[PDB]
Amino acid sequence: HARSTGSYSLVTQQPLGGKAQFGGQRFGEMEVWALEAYGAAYTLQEMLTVKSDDVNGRTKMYKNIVDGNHQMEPGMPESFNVLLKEIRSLGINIELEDE
Amino acid sequence: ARVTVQDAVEKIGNRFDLVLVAARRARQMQVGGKDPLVPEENDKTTVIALREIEEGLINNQILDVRERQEQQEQEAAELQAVTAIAEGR
Amino acid sequence: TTDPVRMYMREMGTVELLTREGEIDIAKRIEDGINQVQCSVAEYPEAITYLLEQYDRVEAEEARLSDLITGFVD
């Protein structure tokens, strides 16, 4: 199986095969540690942000990949952005402070 | 290809700061602002920067120096353009 | 035991079932109570003059008969 850009799950925006063009490989906790033992921060950021969970960063990346500019404008992963609303859905006020 | 980065790791000790410096330079080449400092074999910017590190003509000091110079090279051009903004008064 | 099903059944079970005579007692009490407020309403001059000013709007096509009285005795 191989996938470049396929469909995405509705509940959480994540790679999911809808065409039988299979969703990408699942990057787990152990693989994160494997990246953590190496000094690779950007590989890890792109792994859990632009390549998967960021509904913005993914398209902003794709346009850069065809334009010839290798960069990432990561933003915040939609999983954590959803987790904020679930916490905030309770009586818990969770804010991002300072600047 | 570049099989081992060992020579670059000698030039800058950390080996993590190597990735950073080589990154910054690789974008200077990839986004077209500059050209290679050493013969390009069809090697992509990733490796061209590493060759530039191995030959010791590119690192964090040099880049910051080069960038710091370009600020005044551009500040010289716009000298009249921005001083014409005396309209602020 | 929490489980609010339990705290209701046990909370209501204290009230004793009404005897067939007791219902009429309470119902008689009801009659007294409302008629008191009815008579108390009957004793207000503005309550009358207001009803007058309202029926004058009914005959003037500024309202409808359904929005004021539900009918009299009969």
Added chain:
Amino acid sequence: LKAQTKTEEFDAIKIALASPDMIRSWSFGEVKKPETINYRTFKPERDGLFCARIFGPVKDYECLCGKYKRLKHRGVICEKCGVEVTQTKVRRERMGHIELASPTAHIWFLKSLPSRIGLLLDMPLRDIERVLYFESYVVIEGGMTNLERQQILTEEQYLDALEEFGDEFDAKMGAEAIQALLKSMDLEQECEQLREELNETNSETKRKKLTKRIKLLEAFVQSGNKPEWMILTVLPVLPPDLRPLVPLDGGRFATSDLNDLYRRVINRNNRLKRLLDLAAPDIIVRNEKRMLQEAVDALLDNGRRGRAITGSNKRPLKSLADMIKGKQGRFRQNLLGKRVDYSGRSVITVGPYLRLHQCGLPKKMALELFKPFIYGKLELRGLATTIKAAKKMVEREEAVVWDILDEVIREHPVLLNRAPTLHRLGIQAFEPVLIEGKAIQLHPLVCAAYNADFDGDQMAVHVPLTLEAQLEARALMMSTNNILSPANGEPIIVPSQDVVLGLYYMTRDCVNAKGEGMVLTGPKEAERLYRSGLASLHARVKVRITEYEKDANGELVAKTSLKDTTVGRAILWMIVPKGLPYSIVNQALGKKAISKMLNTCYRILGLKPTVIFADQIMYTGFAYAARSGASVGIDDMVIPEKKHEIISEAEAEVAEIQEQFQSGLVTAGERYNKVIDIWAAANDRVSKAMMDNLQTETVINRDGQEEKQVSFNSIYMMADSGARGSAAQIRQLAGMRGLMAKPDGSIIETPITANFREGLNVLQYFISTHGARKGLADTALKTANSGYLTRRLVDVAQDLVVTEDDCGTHEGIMMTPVIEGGDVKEPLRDRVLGRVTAEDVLKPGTADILVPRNTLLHEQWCDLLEENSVDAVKVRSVVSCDTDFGVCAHCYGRDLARGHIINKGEAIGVIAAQSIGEPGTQLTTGGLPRVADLFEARRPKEPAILAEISGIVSFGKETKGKRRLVITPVDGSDPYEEMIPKWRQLNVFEGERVERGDVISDGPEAPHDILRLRGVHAVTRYIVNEVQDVYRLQGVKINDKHIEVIVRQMLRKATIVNAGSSDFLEGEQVEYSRVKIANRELEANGKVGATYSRDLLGITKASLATESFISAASFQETTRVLTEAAVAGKRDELRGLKENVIVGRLIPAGTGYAYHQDRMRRRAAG
């Protein structure tokens, strides 16, 4: 300058209670109706759980009613039904609220194990619930009459108290009461009163609870939270798209369970509002209030009361607490673990032609993976008019696109991964090589690091998109840049099996072979002799060779001589680069020596020569192994001729001992051991018979009659070289195999007398089955056990990273050889290798500094120490490092995949945990559970006791269940008397002086003591030596470093004794504390500095305390963590690894360490 008011880039995070007005800030409307969608037109009903007015447009940039459909119109709120036309994404963002008639308790603060409302009011839980259910009245602000402030009353009593006192007394019931209590509560005044009472009474029962409560109160005051906020006025509603109703095929609908819950909360709430304007009797509105309370509880966290069930489905509907919660905690980065684009996978194959730095990649996989790059590259050179035409081209697979792919593949590494990722070598970067076919080709030398067989294991590929990832992969994750295990400096790229059988067969010698005795000018004409068929691969021959020694100063010396060697070694010499001596290839080249060859090559010539060397060894190994024609036949396994006779003699012993049991000369138990013993000895006999015969029996002739050398028989060469097989497995093939064991753990006294070369009968196989099944079971279980251990390990360490350069302490541990009972179960050179000296070491004479103070000890320094007789070296360790919140690189060591000293910013904790965890599969008190017991500090079952203090001791009082031991120090005070149960046999001499930490009995001892009585260095030495015994007994090489970092994390916390700044008994960070008394030692108070006592916390216990709550919320119980943090208003600053991964930014280590540093200094500055 002005700070900001819009989107910059946030640091930290804050958590606290939410005010009703604060909840109203988020709400863009009140949901007033249970309606969802219209039921025919599926549009949202206005003022309902799904509403376009409150939440957002159903479709992008289009009003619901349809009046404004144009993308130009944006900030317009439609005049018909107000909907601001904006992207539908905002329906995933905008929140809502619901205004509850009666107040309601928040289940999280009511039912959390230390009930927050309960201990905040100093009121029991059962009472609070009794008040919430309207089952009794509670007093509030009693004034001066008859009654306690928190006192609870019944029906008659409330009535009686009211007739007696009409006013100046107040009592309520239900939620309104608890809210009234919390609002009336003045925390500051309560604090003062509690401080006095703490001082007066001394009792453990009293002041434990006392100190716990005072901490909460003062924390809660500074927090900014006002108690009332634990009672919900306004209830937030989650955005609709996070709990969608979205349609499916066949016209059916599917929706999240929250709706069913949310719907309920509205209805009952609404009903209650109705019931207020109708003046319902008390018994009803109360029941309605209880029902509303129950419904809200089910919404927030279901399962703490009734576990309400969803519509038409038995399964309880999942609530918001269950959405966050799970296995384990937060799935947002728990296993497992989110789907990722630009990836793939398939079965993997060999590809021996590959260089170690590349890998075979299937054509189709590379096409679909690089699709955007191919698109971008196609129109950069102009082979495609536009991006669409480029898509059509690659979708048509026009022949021209293949060359463009060779360009984008060339310099662009790819990440390869296997299923059980353990250490960092589980992912390695390779250069793609376009390969026809659907299978992945993987360099043989790497197959060891992945533990990947070819029996159908699959591997996954990941594309490193951003430039930084390409340079990270190439300069960090690249295959050639990790040639050495991070666990120990030995190469993990060591040739595996076929290659080592080739080199073994290559440099070996038979007695007489073609070309024996002749002489050749050099390896070139040596190979020419062999390849032409004149000379045999193995024959004793003198040839002129030129070896090199760099023993000059940075300079390669050359010397030529006539070496006595074989033809194979001569040919092999062609590969050995430069300064290696010919001595290394002049031996038989087994798997052990062939590894140290690569190792020495790395430690001498550096990285680059070793890589190309390694490749060559593989290539030549495969080639020559193919020439050798090694095989395995049925006649390759030689059974001893004396086997049946040994069985018979061993068979006489059992019948001898049996006759002794029939006549009673020996007891039943003694018989079993006896018969079992004779059979065991027999097994050894057969093993050591076939081993001699198999090993040397090649008996051949050179010019004389006979001679005998090591056998050239195939299977022996396999086992001898180190390729595959071992004396145990060989013994099962030819000699008899073992004595199996019946399930209960006993061992059957009639062993398996046959082997695999012969047949096994019915019985022998059936008895063999248990060993197989227990093996598979044990391995499959010990696999799971190993993984769990690594989890606890990475949880307790993780954030530990090399931070400073040199902490500059002379402190360190004494490194000696392990010296167990015999000679050297492990040398000094291995224990001290790659570490740094604590202080300059002497020759036998002095004012001669061999190694000067703190210096990395490399191969030359270790050999110089070995030249001299030096038996002891003190070495800096990560446990004694003075740097707080990390380890200085100077104290760590050099160890890495590279030989240089550890870099600044490398994350050592992860690699430490991984290095310990990966081998745990091979382990088997004794075994892996023994290791787990060590890292958990657990006190043993029948422990010993150590002398509390030095000085003369004696026995005192009598038998009460403890016979007291009275210690008498010489100078110091006597008073220590320990209660020791006297029915445990003692050791300590009643009349002798015992030093503190002596043996007062026998049996294991708790490491808490060893830390306390013997000291920090003593306990860390004990752990490392004990845990290293377990692994080394199994043959696992793990450097002591990693174990030392785990230990440091165990002792992170300590408990203060004295005072003058903080509280007496508080357990607290020795980083924080030591940095506080070092700051206090000057300025401040002249010295008020407080004494602590280092503590030993088990790994699973020490990992519990973590400053960042987002990290704790992950692997711990989410509810408790969130609550316990939410009350204090705790502010998470990130700064760690786990938390930054959740939020999705750069890890504050490795490549990211530059960023965080640059950001950390910007903070708390101007």
